[PDB]
Design an enzyme around this catalytic site. Structure first.
Site, short mmCIF file in Angstrom:
data_model
loop_
_atom_site.label_atom_id
_atom_site.label_comp_id
_atom_site.label_asym_id
_atom_site.label_seq_id
_atom_site.Cartn_x
_atom_site.Cartn_y
_atom_site.Cartn_z
N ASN A 120 0.81 -1.23 0.00
CA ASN A 120 0.00 0.00 0.00
C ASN A 120 0.83 1.28 0.00
O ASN A 120 0.31 2.33 0.35
CB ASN A 120 -0.96 0.04 1.19
CG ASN A 120 -1.87 -1.16 1.26
OD1 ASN A 120 -1.95 -1.85 2.29
ND2 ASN A 120 -2.55 -1.44 0.16
N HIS A 160 3.27 2.20 1.96
CA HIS A 160 3.63 2.71 3.28
C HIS A 160 4.97 2.07 3.69
O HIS A 160 5.23 0.92 3.33
CB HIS A 160 2.53 2.39 4.31
CG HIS A 160 1.34 3.30 4.21
ND1 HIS A 160 1.27 4.48 4.93
CD2 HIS A 160 0.22 3.19 3.45
CE1 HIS A 160 0.12 5.04 4.58
NE2 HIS A 160 -0.54 4.31 3.69
N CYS A 174 6.76 7.54 8.70
CA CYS A 174 7.72 8.19 7.83
C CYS A 174 7.13 8.04 6.41
O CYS A 174 6.72 6.94 6.03
CB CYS A 174 9.10 7.54 7.94
SG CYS A 174 10.28 8.06 6.66
#
Ligand SMILES: Oc1ccc2cn[nH]c2c1
Ligand SMILES: Oc1ccc2cn[nH]c2c1
Ligand SMILES: Oc1ccc2cn[nH]c2c1
Ligand SMILES: Oc1ccc2cn[nH]c2c1
EC number: 3.1.2.14
Lengths: 264, 263
Positions: A185, A187, A222
């Site tokens: 996804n 991330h 992050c």
């Protein structure tokens, strides 16, 4: 892998691969963390998932608040490590996922891990207490009586972690994730943060000690275009360190942690 | 995994893991390259080795000169990919390792790879021509008749790659390896270089295309304290020319080409 006889936990065996081992000729802590994530994902798939139907309706997700890993003996290349995992509700605070790592040949416990998860809205990023409706849908897949990987009355997995004060004793600056550090996804994978925290441990410690314990708190994500600074200070045979990950620019905190290393 | 009936090649099945997949829910090219490396290591262990007895003591090692990978269909999470690998001597120039990737359920070929390896003294880093003594100790584990994953006359795996001229169309600068990017001997893994090359492909290409072919030449190894710049220029499906070089003086570490098909 497979769910156990009672369907309340999940077990899987992994044969350690050549590219999974580090300079000690044994599996790195990042390889272990990836296997914990893999057995956790297979457990969720085996029981119908780790969002439930209600979470998908309300745009809610589970996010890691804390990860605590303790390794007594790292598997070598070719060794078979067996991992058992289970979940438990912790009231309305969130859920806990635990793991027990064993040498598949001898049955000896070679490691253990515990993680605290909180509920968050995907879009707003606002944390929320677990609703009773969502709780009920998870409880049928969890043991009812407490089952802890870290039972001890005064154990390391639940200690408060302080914020590292400047100047840090050691630092690794300008750390950026690449596309392999992102998940399905886009991330940043939770394991990349472990790698980044350990980057500021000096090479001398890495060459003479083995990482025995790591406790990591997650405060902020992050992003793919973020740059991170990794800071470490010795707090201590064994060596102990305090860790802090923060954004390169303004210094916004993304993680804080502690590690414990034993002499080789 | 296991050696085949004739003991001249090695096969292994892998179930694709959740953390091994990227943004299109299929195994990344870095996951594939790691599996090729893993099946290659297991083949060497099963036949008595990734260095011979005579190579050791004489401080000699095999180093990758070229890697060429072609993927027709990437395995998804949970899929079983079967990989067959074999080696062949190419006279005194070096050795070649080939791979064939299949969907374990249907038996369909979903990918193929070929790599050229050269002999180097580990200390001086000087490349050497393969001695006849070393050739003999390898030919008992290789098929005698040619067996190529890329048989075609003058195909993509053997084409010359030019040096990218400045200015590059795209770039990703300041790339540094972390400790997870190093292998059991503290050397940067060959797969990290693939990741670094692909870093300079713009996100728009990644979102609308799939990587079908990658050819990578290795000129110099990147040390643990080295910093790298990744440069890409479109030469065209979409095609790109790639160059990895040290951040400072611009010393070349790799050059490559990629070919991408629209999703
Ligand atoms: O940077 C580091 C240092 C120590 C370990 C152990 N496993 N992974 C590591 C990475
Ligand atoms: O020697 C060994 C063998 C297997 C396992 C699993 N975790 N650690 C190990 C060490
Ligand atoms: O940076 C990149 C771009 C595309 C792919 C595909 N597999 N791995 C990649 C990395
Ligand atoms: O759908 C599939 C299934 C397995 C493999 C192996 N390589 N590619 C695949 C695609």
């Amino acid at each position: 892998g497979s769910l156990t006889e009672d369907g309340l936990s999940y077990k899987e065996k992994f044969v350690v691969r050549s590219y999974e081992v580090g300079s000690n000729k044994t599996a790195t802590v990042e390889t272990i963390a990836n296997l914990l994530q893999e057995v956790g994902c297979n457990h969720a798939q085996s029981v119908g998932f780790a969002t439930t139907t209600t979470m998908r309706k309300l745009h809610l997700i589970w996010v890691t608040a804390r990860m605590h890993i303790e390794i007594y003996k790292y598997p070598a290349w070719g060794d078979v490590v067996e991992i058992e995992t289970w979940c438990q509700s912790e009231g309305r605070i969130g859920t806990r996922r635990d793991w027990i790592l064993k040498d598949s040949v001898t049955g000896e416990v070679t490691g253990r891990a515990t993680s605290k998860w909180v509920m968050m809205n995907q879009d707003t990023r606002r944390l929320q207490k677990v609703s009773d409706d969502v709780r009920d849908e998870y409880l049928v897949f969890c043991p009812q009586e407490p089952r802890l990987a870290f039972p001890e009355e005064n154990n390391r997995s639940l200690k408060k972690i302080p914020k590292l004060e400047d100047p840090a004793q050691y630092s690794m600056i300008g750390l950026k994730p690449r596309r392999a550090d992102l998940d399905m996804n886009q991330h940043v994978n939770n394991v990349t943060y472990i790698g980044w925290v350990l980057e500021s441990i000096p090479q001398e410690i890495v060459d003479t000690h083995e990482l025995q314990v790591i406790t990591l708190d997650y405060r902020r994500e992050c992003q793919q275009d973020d740059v991170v600074d990794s800071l470490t200070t010795t707090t201590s045979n064994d060596s102990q360190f305090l860790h802090l990950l923060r954004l390169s620019g303004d210094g916004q905190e993304i993680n804080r942690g502690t590690t414990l290393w034993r002499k080789k």
